[PDB]
Design a protein around this motif. Structure first.
Motif, PDB file in Angstrom:
ATOM      1  N   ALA F  26     -54.718  -6.057 -31.092  1.00 42.47           N
ATOM      2  CA  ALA F  26     -54.990  -7.072 -32.111  1.00 42.47           C
ATOM      3  C   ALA F  26     -56.015  -6.575 -33.130  1.00 42.47           C
ATOM      4  O   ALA F  26     -55.821  -6.704 -34.355  1.00 42.47           O
ATOM      5  CB  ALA F  26     -55.466  -8.364 -31.446  1.00 42.47           C
ATOM      6  N   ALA F  27     -57.089  -5.952 -32.641  1.00 41.15           N
ATOM      7  CA  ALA F  27     -58.052  -5.362 -33.562  1.00 41.15           C
ATOM      8  C   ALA F  27     -57.425  -4.247 -34.389  1.00 41.15           C
ATOM      9  O   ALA F  27     -57.749  -4.092 -35.568  1.00 41.15           O
ATOM     10  CB  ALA F  27     -59.265  -4.848 -32.797  1.00 41.15           C
ATOM     11  N   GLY F  28     -56.487  -3.501 -33.806  1.00 43.39           N
ATOM     12  CA  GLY F  28     -55.817  -2.448 -34.538  1.00 43.39           C
ATOM     13  C   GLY F  28     -54.903  -2.962 -35.626  1.00 43.39           C
ATOM     14  O   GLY F  28     -54.756  -2.320 -36.664  1.00 43.39           O
ATOM     15  N   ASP F  29     -54.283  -4.122 -35.411  1.00 42.52           N
ATOM     16  CA  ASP F  29     -53.566  -4.790 -36.493  1.00 42.52           C
ATOM     17  C   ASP F  29     -54.496  -5.040 -37.666  1.00 42.52           C
ATOM     18  O   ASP F  29     -54.191  -4.688 -38.817  1.00 42.52           O
ATOM     19  CB  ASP F  29     -52.995  -6.124 -36.015  1.00 42.52           C
ATOM     20  N   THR F  30     -55.658  -5.630 -37.375  1.00 44.57           N
ATOM     21  CA  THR F  30     -56.632  -5.872 -38.436  1.00 44.57           C
ATOM     22  C   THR F  30     -56.993  -4.579 -39.161  1.00 44.57           C
ATOM     23  O   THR F  30     -57.025  -4.525 -40.396  1.00 44.57           O
ATOM     24  CB  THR F  30     -57.893  -6.509 -37.858  1.00 44.57           C
ATOM     25  N   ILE F  31     -57.224  -3.513 -38.397  1.00 42.15           N
ATOM     26  CA  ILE F  31     -57.773  -2.292 -38.970  1.00 42.15           C
ATOM     27  C   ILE F  31     -56.731  -1.555 -39.805  1.00 42.15           C
ATOM     28  O   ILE F  31     -57.050  -1.022 -40.867  1.00 42.15           O
ATOM     29  CB  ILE F  31     -58.360  -1.409 -37.854  1.00 42.15           C
ATOM     30  N   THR F  32     -55.481  -1.502 -39.348  1.00 47.27           N
ATOM     31  CA  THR F  32     -54.467  -0.856 -40.172  1.00 47.27           C
ATOM     32  C   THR F  32     -54.199  -1.637 -41.452  1.00 47.27           C
ATOM     33  O   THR F  32     -53.969  -1.027 -42.502  1.00 47.27           O
ATOM     34  CB  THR F  32     -53.169  -0.639 -39.391  1.00 47.27           C
ATOM     35  N   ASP F  33     -54.290  -2.973 -41.414  1.00 52.85           N
ATOM     36  CA  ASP F  33     -54.181  -3.714 -42.669  1.00 52.85           C
ATOM     37  C   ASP F  33     -55.341  -3.388 -43.607  1.00 52.85           C
ATOM     38  O   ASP F  33     -55.142  -3.185 -44.816  1.00 52.85           O
ATOM     39  CB  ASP F  33     -54.116  -5.213 -42.394  1.00 52.85           C
ATOM     40  N   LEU F  34     -56.557  -3.295 -43.062  1.00 54.35           N
ATOM     41  CA  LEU F  34     -57.709  -2.958 -43.891  1.00 54.35           C
ATOM     42  C   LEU F  34     -57.575  -1.565 -44.491  1.00 54.35           C
ATOM     43  O   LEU F  34     -57.886  -1.358 -45.665  1.00 54.35           O
ATOM     44  CB  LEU F  34     -58.996  -3.060 -43.078  1.00 54.35           C
ATOM     45  N   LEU F  35     -57.087  -0.605 -43.708  1.00 48.80           N
ATOM     46  CA  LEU F  35     -56.925   0.751 -44.215  1.00 48.80           C
ATOM     47  C   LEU F  35     -55.859   0.828 -45.293  1.00 48.80           C
ATOM     48  O   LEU F  35     -56.013   1.578 -46.258  1.00 48.80           O
ATOM     49  CB  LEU F  35     -56.596   1.709 -43.075  1.00 48.80           C
ATOM     50  N   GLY F  36     -54.791   0.038 -45.175  1.00 53.61           N
ATOM     51  CA  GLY F  36     -53.808   0.011 -46.243  1.00 53.61           C
ATOM     52  C   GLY F  36     -54.371  -0.547 -47.534  1.00 53.61           C
ATOM     53  O   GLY F  36     -54.152   0.014 -48.613  1.00 53.61           O
ATOM     54  N   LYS F  37     -55.156  -1.621 -47.440  1.00 52.66           N
ATOM     55  CA  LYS F  37     -55.802  -2.139 -48.643  1.00 52.66           C
ATOM     56  C   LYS F  37     -56.809  -1.152 -49.222  1.00 52.66           C
ATOM     57  O   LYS F  37     -56.932  -1.035 -50.443  1.00 52.66           O
ATOM     58  CB  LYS F  37     -56.472  -3.475 -48.346  1.00 52.66           C
ATOM     59  N   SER F  64     -66.467  -3.237 -49.009  1.00 51.38           N
ATOM     60  CA  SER F  64     -66.397  -4.421 -48.157  1.00 51.38           C
ATOM     61  C   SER F  64     -65.341  -4.269 -47.070  1.00 51.38           C
ATOM     62  O   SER F  64     -65.582  -4.617 -45.907  1.00 51.38           O
ATOM     63  CB  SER F  64     -66.121  -5.655 -49.002  1.00 51.38           C
ATOM     64  N   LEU F  65     -64.173  -3.728 -47.421  1.00 51.06           N
ATOM     65  CA  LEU F  65     -63.142  -3.524 -46.411  1.00 51.06           C
ATOM     66  C   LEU F  65     -63.590  -2.506 -45.368  1.00 51.06           C
ATOM     67  O   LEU F  65     -63.289  -2.644 -44.172  1.00 51.06           O
ATOM     68  CB  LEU F  65     -61.839  -3.089 -47.078  1.00 51.06           C
ATOM     69  N   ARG F  66     -64.357  -1.505 -45.799  1.00 51.29           N
ATOM     70  CA  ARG F  66     -64.893  -0.526 -44.864  1.00 51.29           C
ATOM     71  C   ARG F  66     -65.824  -1.180 -43.849  1.00 51.29           C
ATOM     72  O   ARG F  66     -65.737  -0.904 -42.652  1.00 51.29           O
ATOM     73  CB  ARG F  66     -65.610   0.579 -45.635  1.00 51.29           C
ATOM     74  N   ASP F  67     -66.709  -2.068 -44.306  1.00 53.93           N
ATOM     75  CA  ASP F  67     -67.576  -2.771 -43.356  1.00 53.93           C
ATOM     76  C   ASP F  67     -66.785  -3.684 -42.415  1.00 53.93           C
ATOM     77  O   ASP F  67     -67.133  -3.832 -41.227  1.00 53.93           O
ATOM     78  CB  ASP F  67     -68.627  -3.576 -44.108  1.00 53.93           C
TER      79      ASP F  67
END
Lengths: 53, 53, 164, 53, 53, 109, 53, 53, 55
Positions: F26-37, F64-67
């Motif tokens: 679940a956290a990885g879903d969040t993180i791959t979306d953040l990395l795409g943005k 901000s996405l990095r944080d």
């Protein structure tokens, strides 16, 4: 053990059935009101906050 | 816009999630039928020793 | 089970933060529109072909829009708390059941937070020409602050999905 | 497995239905505003650039 | 002409392509109905074992 | 019989491992979306037709996405243990009644 | 989510429809008067300057 | 002009916003169907114990 | 009792910071309560096993 006057197992089974019936009453109230907190009894602080808001 | 935000916030505080309640309702109805069956099983204990006499 | 049950409070807090940011963004809509009109007033007043009456009318409109900014920023409150009215440096919403915070830095939308004052104005065409750049800076900083608040709102929503 | 108290499959199905409802809310906002970036929440940098322009 | 170019550029940055949104809307409405049906299927799991008692 | 009964602990441990990996995914879903943005921000900022204000807005969004990535990775815990937050090299779950391990190598997010 | 008491999406959709209706009222006033600044409400400084001229 | 202002002001005081009412109507009709279903569920409680006899 | 859980008859919070500390205090109280109840349950099972042996 092997008593005819006291059925301890039936007493416990009735307590568990009453617990299930209580949960069922709660879910019915949520369904007919649409509210998880429909009255002060459900959660008094959140209910009062929602009333004031 | 502020009135709409306050009303949506009240809904966030008190409204039930009915999709979740539908699952809870089905499982609780099954649990109630099982509890009635378990109580019937517990009620039978006294009659087991009637055969010994 | 008690840990799972306490996540309901975390979700309530994250939704409260999204509501607070929503009210700030509505006030920010008002304020960026006011700043655009104010830049239009200052730009017109820097023209030297204006007679004195037209210059004074533009200055009067500019001062009124400036006061409306103060009203908009002061009203940007959700149930007594604001992320944009300047009364705090940050709001902290629950991130997890241990009480660790989800910080949202305050983004002040008052005249002082925009680099203006309650008396900002122009009395000559040259002062209005300088006010053009001052208002451009105020509008740019306002849109940057609102963009940060929007990214914070999206981060709250993503964390709320994760908490569920 | 074969539980009456926890429906893990219903929990996942509700998560997937909520994800679909969220996408549907986004498409409705795009339809009524005509904007793929209608607010700072959609994409703050592009929104701010468009506001200044 | 410059004002028209700036306005058209803002439209390039923020405007939705509504023809694409109409397709997304139809598919998401189908997906939502399927999600409600899948949740109904998942809700039925508890009642399967009632037959064993 | 005692050996068969101890398999309940093995099953509890394997289910615990599946739960821990679920939280990491679940956290990885969040993180791959953040990395795409974030890649979208960096791609836009490499264009040289941008003025300074647009470049700065993209850089601010990127930071901000990095944080948010750090927040997502730090919250990827299941009852105090994580396979993705970087605090350990591996988790070992029970494989059999003798206590032999089922290793899961940590994957730091 | 899945509430029957609060429709947040309908509240936002109504706000967007009201914004469109307001723009439509403005365009109707421009059409029937022939004026982009027909009153003091439209732009007080330019309106007053035009009145004096 | 004064008569038109007075009539528009009366409309501001008493007129319904029908776009908002359409949303309230749909949600209330759903809520009424759910209330009838919840009452049917509550009506079933007496028949659960018939199995014990 | 409240004293056995590490609380007092006046335990409370007056500020958000005090409530943040009370989070950990209540976590400790709940953990110690469940440990005490688990010990009582093991003692009850030990009594039942001894009763079977005595029979």
């Amino acid at each position: 053990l092997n008593s005819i006057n006291t059925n301890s197992g039936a007493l416990i089974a009735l307590q568990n059935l009453n617990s299930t019936n209580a949960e069922l009453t709660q879910v019915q109230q949520r369904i007919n009101t649409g509210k998880k907190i429909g009255s002060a009894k459900d959660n008094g602080a959140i209910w009062a906050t929602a009333k004031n808001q | 816009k502020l009135q709409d935000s306050l009303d949506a916030g009240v809904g966030n505080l008190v409204d039930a999630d009915l999709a979740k309640e539908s699952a809870k309702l089905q499982s609780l109805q099954t649990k109630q039928q099982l509890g009635v069956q378990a109580l019937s099983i517990a009620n039978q204990s006294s009659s087991s020793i009637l055969s010994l006499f | 089970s008690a840990t799972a049950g306490s996540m309901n409070a975390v979700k309530d807090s994250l939704q409260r933060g999204q509501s607070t940011i929503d009210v700030a963004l509505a006030a920010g809509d008002t304020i960026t529109d006011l700043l655009g009109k104010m830049k239009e007033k200052a730009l017109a007043a820097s023209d030297t072909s204006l007679n004195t009456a037209s210059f004074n009318a533009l200055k009067s409109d500019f001062d009124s829009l400036r006061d409306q900014i103060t009203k908009a920023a002061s009203n940007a409150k959700f149930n007594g708390v604001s992320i944009a009215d300047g009364t705090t440096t940050k709001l902290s919403f629950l991130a997890n059941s241990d009480g660790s915070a989800f910080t949202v830095t305050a983004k002040t939308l008052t005249l002082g937070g925009l680099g203006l004052t309650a008396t900002s104005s122009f009395t000559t065409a040259a002062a209005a020409k300088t006010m053009i750049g001052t208002i451009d800076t105020a509008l740019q900083t306002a849109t940057n602050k609102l963009a940060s608040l929007g990214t914070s709102s999206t981060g709250l929503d993503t964390h709320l999905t994760f908490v569920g």
